Design a protein around this nucleic acid. Structure first.
Ligand SMILES: [Mg+2]
Ligand SMILES: [Mg+2]
Ligand SMILES: [Zn+2]
Lengths: 41, 97, 49, 94, 160, 177, 38
RNA sequence: GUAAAUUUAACUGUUAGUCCAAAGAGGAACAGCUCUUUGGACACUAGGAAAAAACCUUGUAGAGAGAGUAAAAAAUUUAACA
């Protein structure tokens, strides 16, 4: 019954990620005590 | 002692080849952040404590400069738009997942 | 699908990057050896007939 | 029920309370909240990744724009992991 | 005693990249065997959920999961709601492990099960050609046939 | 990740404050990597319409280094449009007047020439010396590695390496030197 | 000085020196021999 | 190796032409000049040489959120002489 109009994205998934969607802190190492760069402590 | 990549930011990658040599098996368990690497969570006598509700009305200029400083943008994003564009906007956009 | 894995399957993409880096290192090793050393585990080519 | 989140179907108020209750009833030390990751902080658009640890073992992690909402999200993630209704769980068999 | 070929350490006496030594083949092969056995026992036990696959189909590569939908730009000679097996699986993976074909994984190892659920036409597409000052103008309207397939299941078997 | 939808979107599209150091670095390489970060081309979710730029905080911009004779060759040209507004200043003069202008101009040139360039420049932050405002320092994440390697002047060499490098020739005993 | 493309020594006291990126013929006894490469 | 050719019948339209390579002529061994010949391309598509007629890559038509390629990015820093 759906309209025959333009269909974006010729694929529809509801679970696009299984290992966790990328965020900037993926592939980012952690640091001792979580110190910021040039932190005086 | 040989690792293709540093093994300390996303997952512990271990590559392997099956005996027939026809397929590659990758073992990648996640790397968890150490507790040691984390950081702890940061922390009128006579009258009411009257709620301090002041909202100074800024005229359009200084208002837009304050917003631009706050969000690190320029003024053009904040200046308004006309009825033509305002009506051309789709108010019921398609929404997938 | 490489971009799809880079965005949605970061661990799988890291595995792929590790495999490619290993293949590059094996290529460098073969080039420097220049002899008839064993071809390399992941440098082996599956043949079809 | 195919493609919705646990707390999108079943609304809850205090995930931290539910989480500490579950940990207590399965004999686990109370979770400690810690700032695993942080970006910004002085700006109007900060990012806080708060991790919930138990006995110095990370049990959950959650992002947010404020530390409090990030901690609440981490609590919800821990609840999802504990009840098994997680995103990467085994899909239904038809 | 300097070897006949010793170069004093300068900025460019040696290549800038770090020296890399690859693992020896024998120990590395036994390591591969252990890793493959570990992944196999993970599969046997069932320590996975929500598999995903990269599948070749209709000249395309699709990253699909279970309960998925894909739109194929042609008719497929199949009645509606018909279950078929997608077979050319370039990749299958889950959390903590993934399997890579060279270039295709063995059919004994993984099955993709899909279902034809719709046979439709695309929205009308416009092909207009125009060349100026030469009176050149053509218009055509096309509707490519299409097939909507639902990915039902991705299954793996212990075979490594 | 089992995150909720809104926090997941926020985490994916959040902005990151990178730190970069001048101090004997080429302005061009600094600008190249800073421009990549400002455009957001380092993110795999990048798209020109997704507003995925990141903040770049560059410091010691007063202590950059130019290869060759660029300090005296390179000429920056501008025109105040009044008849005779054509001014041309060498890199030395421009650096002496403004200590961040050179790096700013390099990044501006490397950025894409569209309407997002000024927004990216607004997210870029430059500082001529070691001092950084406290709010920015509290925002910072990830000091990126420097492109150049600072070739380590002779007096900075240790005695171990000084004596480990062989002496190449035998001088005559009778030369004044 | 005289501008020249090809510099020539006209005296035995003439000497060539490269200063400011250009070659010069300087002569202390016959200053008419001063030449500047162009 | 190929598949076109000649004849018969019936006619229209083109007959104010440009660059490039090559062999020449005129002119200044000037011209985005003029005149012949041989061959391309343009007066039809697409990619490249910044924009682009004539240079280079490429032709036979549609859809694709696939893939392999074609052409395709200028290099150079010089004067001591008993
Ligand atoms: Mg002509
Ligand atoms: Mg064709
Ligand atoms: Zn002289």
């Amino acid at each position: 019954g759906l309209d025959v109009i333009r269909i974006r994205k010729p694929f529809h998934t509801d679970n696009p990620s299984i290992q966790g969607q990328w965020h900037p802190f993926t592939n980012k190492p952690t640091t001792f005590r979580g110190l910021r760069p040039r932190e005086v402590q | 002692t040989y690792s293709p990549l540093p093994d300390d930011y996303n997952c512990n990658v271990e590559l392997a080849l099956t005996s027939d040599g026809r397929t590659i098996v990758c073992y990648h368990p996640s790397v968890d952040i150490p507790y040691e690497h984390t950081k702890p969570i940061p922390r009128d006598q006579v009258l009411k404590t009257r709620l301090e509700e002041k909202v100074e009305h800024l005229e359009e200029g200084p208002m837009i400069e304050q917003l631009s400083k706050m969000f690190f943008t320029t003024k053009h994003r904040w200046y308004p738009h006309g009825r033509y564009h305002r009506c051309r906007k789709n108010l019921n956009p398609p929404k997938d997942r | 699908v490489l971009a799809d894995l880079a965005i949605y399957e970061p661990k799988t993409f890291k595995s792929l990057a590790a495999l490619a880096s290993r293949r590059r290192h094996e290529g460098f090793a073969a080039a420097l050896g220049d002899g008839k050393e064993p071809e390399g585990i992941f440098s082996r080519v599956v043949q079809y007939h | 029920m195919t493609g919705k989140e646990l707390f999108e179907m079943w609304k809850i108020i205090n995930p931290m309370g539910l989480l500490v209750e579950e940990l207590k009833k399965r004999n686990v030390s109370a979770p400690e909240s810690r700032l695993t990751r942080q970006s910004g902080g002085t700006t109007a658009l900060p990012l806080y990744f708060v991790g919930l640890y138990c006995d110095k073992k990370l049990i959950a992690e959650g992002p947010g724009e404020t530390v409090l909402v990030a901690e609440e999200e981490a609590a919800r993630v821990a609840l999802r992991k504990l009840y098994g209704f997680t995103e990467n769980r085994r899909p239904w068999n038809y | 005693s300097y070897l006949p070929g010793y170069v004093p350490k300068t900025s460019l006496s040696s290549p800038p990249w770090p020296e890399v030594v690859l693992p020896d083949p024998v120990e590395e092969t036994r390591h591969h065997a252990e890793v493959v056995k570990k992944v196999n026992e993970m599969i046997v036990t069932g320590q996975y959920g929500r598999l995903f696959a990269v599948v070749h189909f209709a000249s395309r590569q699709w990253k699909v999961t279970s309960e998925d939908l894909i739109l194929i730009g042609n008719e497929l000679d199949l009645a509606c709601g018909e279950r078929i097996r997608l077979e050319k699986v370039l990749l299958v993976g889950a959390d903590n492990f993934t399997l890579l074909g060279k270039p295709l994984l063995g059919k004994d190892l993984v099955r993709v099960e899909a279902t034809v659920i719709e046979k439709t036409e695309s929205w009308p597409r416009i092909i207009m050609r125009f060349r100026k000052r030469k009176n050149f103008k053509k218009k055509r309207i096309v509707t490519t046939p299409q097939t909507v397939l639902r990915i039902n299941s991705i299954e793996i078997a212990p075979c490594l | 990740s089992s995150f909720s939808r809104a926090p997941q979107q926020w985490a994916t599209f959040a902005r990151i404050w990178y730190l970069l150091d001048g101090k004997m670095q080429p302005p061009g390489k600094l600008a190249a990597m800073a421009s990549i970060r400002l455009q957001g081309l380092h993110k795999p979710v990048y798209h020109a319409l997704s507003d995925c730029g990141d903040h770049v905080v560059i410091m010691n911009t007063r202590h950059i280094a130019f290869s060759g004779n660029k300090w005296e060759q390179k000429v920056y040209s501008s025109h105040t449009g009044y008849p005779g507004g054509f001014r041309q200043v060498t890199a030395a003069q421009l650096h002496l007047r403004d200590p961040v202008a050179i790096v700013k101009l390099a990044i501006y040139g490397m950025l894409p020439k569209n309407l997002h360039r000024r927004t990216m420049m607004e997210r870029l932050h430059l500082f001529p010396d070691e001092y950084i405002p406290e709010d920015i320092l509290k925002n910072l994440v990830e000091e990126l590695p420097q492109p150049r390697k600072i070739p380590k002047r002779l007096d900075e060499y240790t005695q171990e390496e000084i004596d480990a490098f062989p002496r190449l020739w035998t001088p005559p005993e009778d030369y004044r030197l | 000085f005289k501008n020249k493309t090809v510099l020539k020594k006209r005296c035995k006291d003439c000497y060539l020196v490269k200063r400011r990126g250009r070659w010069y013929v300087y002569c202390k006894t016959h200053p008419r021999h001063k030449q500047r490469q162009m």
